[PDB]
């Protein structure tokens, strides 16, 4: 089964800084990687699907990229509303698996 390791587990940064979250899949998932933002105690929200396309209604600071089995999420300039846990999903197969979550905290 495809398993995806998301790193770093938690990185702290301030507003206006470019923050990058990477996530690597053990097996080959073509491009079906989606990024979700979840603030504590609420339902997750979709940000990027297909590893490069950002969902309608999402700020342009979020962006995704892919180089082989390595997927990255970058925020161009942080905001006070961008400190949450970010997950990494593959949907290449019917058995969907998630990442582990990378909590971004104000520092």
């Amino acid at each position: 089964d495809i398993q995806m390791t998301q790193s770093p587990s938690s990185l702290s940064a301030s507003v206006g800084d470019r923050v990058t979250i990477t996530c690597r899949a053990s097996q080959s998932v073509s491009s079906a990687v989606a990024w979700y933002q979840q603030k504590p105690g609420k339902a997750p929200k979709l940000l990027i699907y297909s590893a490069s396309s950002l969902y309608s209604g999402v700020p342009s600071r979020f962006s995704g990229s892919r180089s082989g089995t390595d997927f990255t999420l970058t925020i161009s300039s942080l905001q006070p509303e961008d400190f949450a846990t970010y997950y990494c999903q593959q949907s290449s197969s019917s058995l969907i698996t998630f990442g582990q979550g990378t909590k971004v905290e104000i520092k």
């Binding site: 080959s28 998932v29 073509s30 892919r66 180089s67 082989g68």
Partner: protein, 335 residues
């Protein structure tokens, strides 16, 4: 007289599985004689033959089953495109497995044959290791509806597993194309050129293998063969549609890699200017001074330079003046 084609001849193993709606049994043996009574049974079975180099085995099975020789040379002939043969007693299909290696990009293909005979399916593989393990797992663990059907469903399962392996191959090639395009765009290098060329060749081989296979599946389902039951027509139709998907992806991938090659090979211009200007200025600078240095190699009793005082400083100054004049005139012509 049958001649083999496979380069390697290291291993040879025979196995057979007899499954029925009630009971099940699998057999493994080395002697060719043990597989003879299995065809006599009414229950569909599946003889797995690894290694076609053992020509006596294939000759024996061909003469016992009632197979025309041309099928035997075709099974022995690895270097051939996939095709289907319709005969009044059996259908003969040859396919091609594929293995892709990462960190060392090559595409290796191993021919596989499939003969469907009444209530038995014959296949002749080339080496150990294949892509039909899930079919055996479903046979052993009572998964699906394969046991409830006849040998046509077994042939369907084999072809479907092979197409699934083709999909996995396409995933690996997808990763290769992504990293290759990223590397080429980020930094054009000779190793990237070799990778692009190898990937284009691999895609060409894939197309040459997959496009006939779509026609093969179309023949299997649309022609309504007498041996293939009408109940298994939709399954062959589904495999045909999967082959459609594979072909479309292969064409798109070749288009991407060809575009990459064209973009890389577009720019060659700067050399003809830069290196040629360098050569011309160097030659035009250094030939005249060499001529002035060599004209004094003339051997004579009398020559003016002998009497002249400070002849060496004079000739050096003249040569320097000529070089300065030439280099100044070079700025008039630019470059």
């Amino acid at each position: 007289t049958l001649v083999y084609t496979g380069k390697y001849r290291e291993d040879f193993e025979i196995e057979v599985m007899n499954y029925s709606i009630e009971e099940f049994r699998e057999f493994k043996t080395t002697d060719v004689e043990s597989v003879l009574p299995f065809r006599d049974s009414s229950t569909p079975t599946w003889i797995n033959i690894t290694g076609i180099h053992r020509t006596d085995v294939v000759q024996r099975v061909g003469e016992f089953f009632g197979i025309h020789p041309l099928v035997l040379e075709d099974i022995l002939n690895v270097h051939q495109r996939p095709k289907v043969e319709f005969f009044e007693n059996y259908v003969f299909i040859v396919l091609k497995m594929f293995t892709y290696d990462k960190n060392l990009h090559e595409l290796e293909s191993e021919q596989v044959s499939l003969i469907l005979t009444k209530n038995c399916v014959l296949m002749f593989q080339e080496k150990i290791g294949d892509v039909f393990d899930p079919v055996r797992e479903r046979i052993r663990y009572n998964r699906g509806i394969i046991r409830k059907k006849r040998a046509d469903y077994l042939l369907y399962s084999l072809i479907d597993a092979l197409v699934d392996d083709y999909f996995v191959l396409l995933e690996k090639i997808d990763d290769e194309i992504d990293v290759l395009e990223e590397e080429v765009l980020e930094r054009p290098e000779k190793e990237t050129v070799q990778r692009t060329h190898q990937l284009k060749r691999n895609l060409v081989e894939l197309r040459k293998t997959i496009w006939p296979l779509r026609e093969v599946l179309s023949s299997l389902y649309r022609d309504v063969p007498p041996l293939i039951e009408k109940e298994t027509v939709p399954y062959f139709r589904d495999v045909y549609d999967h082959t459609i998907q594979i072909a479309d992806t292969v064409e798109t991938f070749r288009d991407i890699v060809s575009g990459l090659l064209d973009v890389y090979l577009s720019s060659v211009s700067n050399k003809t200017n830069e290196v040629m200007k360098v050569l011309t200025i160097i030659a035009t600078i250094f030939m005249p001074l060499t001529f002035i240095a060599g004209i004094y190699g003339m051997n004579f009793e009398y020559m003016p330079e002998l009497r002249w005082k400070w002849g060496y400083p004079v000739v050096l100054a003249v040569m320097g003046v000529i070089a300065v004049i030439m280099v100044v005139y070079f700025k008039k012509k630019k470059w």
